[PDB]
Symmetry: D2
Subunit: 373 residues, 4 copies
């Protein structure tokens, strides 16, 4: 049993831009961007609920800006792709209900106390687990094929799940292959199952997963239910921050529990999560580790981190005491300085709402810092 004594399976899932939870996350980030464009100091905590023909915004937004919530929500939904009743949703005729408590208004304190985890594994060039990377890439490929007209029977909603067979390597993980792949994408009433499954197997899966991972034993659950036509908000309710694991690492590492979308820099469960990801990516890309996890706990009012811990999974020459000292030397994790270090006042947050907050190049927390130790 040499094969299975150092081998395991790990699953991770992702959801496309049409998934109602992701509709809500993207709309929340759209509102946050709309406010940040005019008032970079806006204090925004927005929560979105998507149901059959209904978008509900609720939360606290104290800012000097004047935002057209109808326009923002409808433009976000249109960009998602829902523009007809035949698809189960229509930005033109959807209902937007605004319940925001807008009110006229470094060592800033934290927004609330929270656990926040960052994690970096060098098994991919993006320093992220392979399972979530593949799931996000599959959803992105489905969206790309739907939007350019290659497969007109696709619809915005979709859920993907990749099970990857891994082998341990002195504290790190190396992906051997792809044991299973599940795809469930909303479609129209015209196309038949055979065509859909053939297209998903050939045009989508084989154009994303390198052939060195797919072999003849791979298991394919393509449209396992057999009919996915009623989808989007019609087929399920959605809320902001209900897909937190899909956002960060798809199971790997850990999660403090705080949602990301809809929150500005002062809400520490977003800015500090970004800072912990920055620390972990810096340690991994700085050569110190090969797989690192950083836990940071902040308290409300109190500015400085209330607790910090590191776990390198035994992949470093430095006991995580030394790594923690390095993190203190190089990284100032107060929210007031995290803002300046990561430019968290820019309207660059909707880009993070779909296909994961991490592993994408264009984000300041994805640029490792030069560590001096």
């Amino acid at each position: 049993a040499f094969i299975e004594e150092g081998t395991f399976l790990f699953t991770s899932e992702s959801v496309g831009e049409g998934h109602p939870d992701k509709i809500c996350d993207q709309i929340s980030d759209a509102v946050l961007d709309a406010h940040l464009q005019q008032d970079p100091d806006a204090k925004v905590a927005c929560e979105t609920v998507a149901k059959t023909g209904m978008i509900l915004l609720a939360g606290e937004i104290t800012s000097r800006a004047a935002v057209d919530y109808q326009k923002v929500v409808r433009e976000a939904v249109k960009h998602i792709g829902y523009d007809d009743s035949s698809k189960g949703f229509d930005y033109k005729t959807c209902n937007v209900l605004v319940a925001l408590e807008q009110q006229s208004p470094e060592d800033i304190g934290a927004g609330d106390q929270g656990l926040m985890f960052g994690y970096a594994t060098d098994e991919t060039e993006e320093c992220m687990p392979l399972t979530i990377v593949l799931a996000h890439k599959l959803n992105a490929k489905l969206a790309e094929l739907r939007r350019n007209g290659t497969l007109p029977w696709l619809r915005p909603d979709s859920k993907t799940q990749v099970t990857v067979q891994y082998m341990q390597d002195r504290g790190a993980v190396l992906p051997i292959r792809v044991h299973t792949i599940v795809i469930s994408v909303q479609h129209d009433e015209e196309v038949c199952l055979d065509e859909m499954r053939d297209a998903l197997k050939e045009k989508v899966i084989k154009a994303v997963v390198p052939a060195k991972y797919l072999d003849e034993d791979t298991i394919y659950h393509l449209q396992p239910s057999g009919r996915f036509v009623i989808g989007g908000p019609q087929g399920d309710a959605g809320l902001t921050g209900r897909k937190i694991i899909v956002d960060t690492y798809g199971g790997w590492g850990a999660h403090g529990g705080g949602a990301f979308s809809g929150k500005d820099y002062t809400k520490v469960d977003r800015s500090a999560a970004y800072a912990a990801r920055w620390v972990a990516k810096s340690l991994v890309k700085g050569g110190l580790c090969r797989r690192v996890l950083v836990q940071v706990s902040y308290a409300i009012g109190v500015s400085h981190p209330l607790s910090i811990s590191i776990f390198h999974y035994g992949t470093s020459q430095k006991s995580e005491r030394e790594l923690l000292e390095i993190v203190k030397k190089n990284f100032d994790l107060r929210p007031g300085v995290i803002v300046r270090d990561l430019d968290l006042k820019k309207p660059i947050y909707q880009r993070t709402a779909a296909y994961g907050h991490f592993g994408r190049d264009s984000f300041p927390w994805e640029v490792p810092k030069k560590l001096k130790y």
Copy 2:
């Protein structure tokens, strides 16, 4: 040296997210009382003077959502405008629909009923406490419970339902297991009224609550206490915040330990693997820990919609066992049948026992079928 710190959070029954969780589980119980086969997925949104139920509930039951919601809120303890919420005059909007027929397509025999949705779900058990749960989450939940108890019996009449008790503990490693040494930090921030002064609340929380919950062997003289760190916290509950079902998933399970599959528990019946499979994985982990096989174990299962059997199962005993994960997996397969249709029979997931789980964690409490270990036969 082998010493680290770990934090874990918990929120009281008044926290808006937990208001939503309790209301969702109350609707689920109301349906399960009349229709054990009810298919329920009920998300809840709570904010100033508004409770909104949205989701899909297909069942033969006839439920009065107004009474369910208002009695849940009353039991929480919000019964006056001075507290920021009032069950009598709160607004309940019902946007419930029928389960999508496409999902009902994937009808069939019970024993091989397919998964209600795909996804990965984790279980975890560490024997550092008699409940096989991490110490930090246990202490946070007990602090919230003590605050609720003191508020409800009139010992401290200036308390109010919302609270957030949330603790940092110092740990030492020992051959893959963790032993808690002391409580490094404790943060308490509980809603109160205007007439009470800050010094009195901080003294009472230090003496009345902390000393009656945390064993003295953990509290040292160097312990850091952040009691009401934000001065006044009078505006709380759904007012001055917003809630949603399943937005406190980590608070529910292990407070950061192990891992989470991202799936919310509250509002879902047995067909939703997000809840049934999480309960089954917790059962497997507690069975392995209590069975002596390991001192600290993590289990992962994954499902695909319409496929009854798990797509993948994995174990990680953290190096605290004589048995490699391969033969632990074999033990789990021989002893545990993890299909939802057999999980429902084994854990009696059709009983209206779900609101009790909505507050103070789904695990670590003895009265639940998934918290009684199985007799392992290997």
Copy 3:
């Protein structure tokens, strides 16, 4: 002669008008409840706007009703079944905020009360009116407006004019001549029609079709001349209509429902209310009294007013005005009404079978003037 004649206008709105959408949905909920619990106490208001139907009110009943199904079936019957039309029953949002009837009213009205002597469901004044200028004993203007809307709906539904859409609004101005207290309609001075349509049809086509296929098939040639004024689609485009482009509420078209300005109104909405609410029961009873007086030969044009106070079964006040078209002074007519008509809610419910689910039929095209309803059946007067 312009000196001895006058003009009177009256408007009406089609089944697609958001206010009528709300009225029809409220009556649909009332019918759904009355089908199972004839004693259901229902007071439902509906608010319809783009992609949202909201039911708010008090419903105390033993029935179990699927509000989603009722609302969506009502909307489908109205004709909104695609986003291109601005509304879709499949994907519209239905929010239910219904509660139980307040116990105060329950104890003050009907609890522990015999049927014949249950107090008024609420205070207020209610009017009835009958004019013999039409066989339906209704003014010609409102009759013509309702018939124009009905013809538009009929043409849309059978596919004759596929470019029509559910929303519409007609308004007929009629030239009357006074005749010893009564009114005789001479001709139709003006007609304005504005019906929702699609983007691909040209304005001239719609104007010609409305002139020829709709108006000519409804208004008798006796009333149409070459001097009649036609405002057919006077606002160019009417393509963004229905709940989108205009909000709606229950009971916001009360005058369209009863007489289109003739007589008077007590301000009380009809839709969504059961027999205990005098706003509906007493209005129906006053219409019954007025039509009985007109059809019984006593008058040619009559108005009746009743008033109630919550918890008091008997009317507080009753008044008649025959417009000087009778041999009997209003005292005599009022004594006839008292002798022959019993206007308590508890006896009205039995005399008009107000417990049957026949209320959605009244939601569109007016509550009166249609023979299918008990209050439109004159009673044999005995004096």
Copy 4:
């Protein structure tokens, strides 16, 4: 030769009037920053919920939460014990923020110095008196909600009506759980009714239905849903004259439902005050008629012989004042100034 006529009114706390006042408050909030604002606002009040729907095209930036809560506070709902609380009520804004027909009636009767029917005048006065006694602490057991009804006995004078006496009065005002029925019915008779209705109209045969329900503790939006424009007859004449069916509250000048009703009232009051008539009705319709009830020396043909804003200043934020206690019969409004 006499007859009876009833008319009702509703106090500031009535849920329909809560909605009307909130709609007019939103309209005012817009008109203060953009005189050309195009507003059509519908309001719905239910247990602990205020919902704003409709369409507003304007350059103004308005805080709907603040406007609604301040209006509700001015109404008097500031505690759950009263069934509503501006602090914790839910305001849902469904307004369609945008990119910048019908028949109407007017009527005037000189039976009162305000050129309005006596019944609606007395009903509005009774509601106002209840509000005053509730707000100055004279009767602390009163709550904002209230409904009043006056049945007056009239006699005819050559096509004109002259009131004789008040035949019936009904008062139903929300109270608290403490006061007893005897105290409420004595106070509503001696302190409210006797201070409003002149004694020449009240005699020993008058019928008093004071608190006919017995218990009216649950009231306001909790006890009944409300909507904008559901009390249109209470707004104008309480049954007298006629109504075109169009609601007033929430609409700016472009909506003939409001501006044209004001213009028709102006015409009717001008004819009555100018001496031509003693009781006149005017009927207009957009995309004209008169009936002087036989109280003029000249037929309706000689009496019949978008520019209103310039003459009525319909762009000024003076609209919430009209939301409660009737749109007419009050001195301060420009349409109540005969020309």
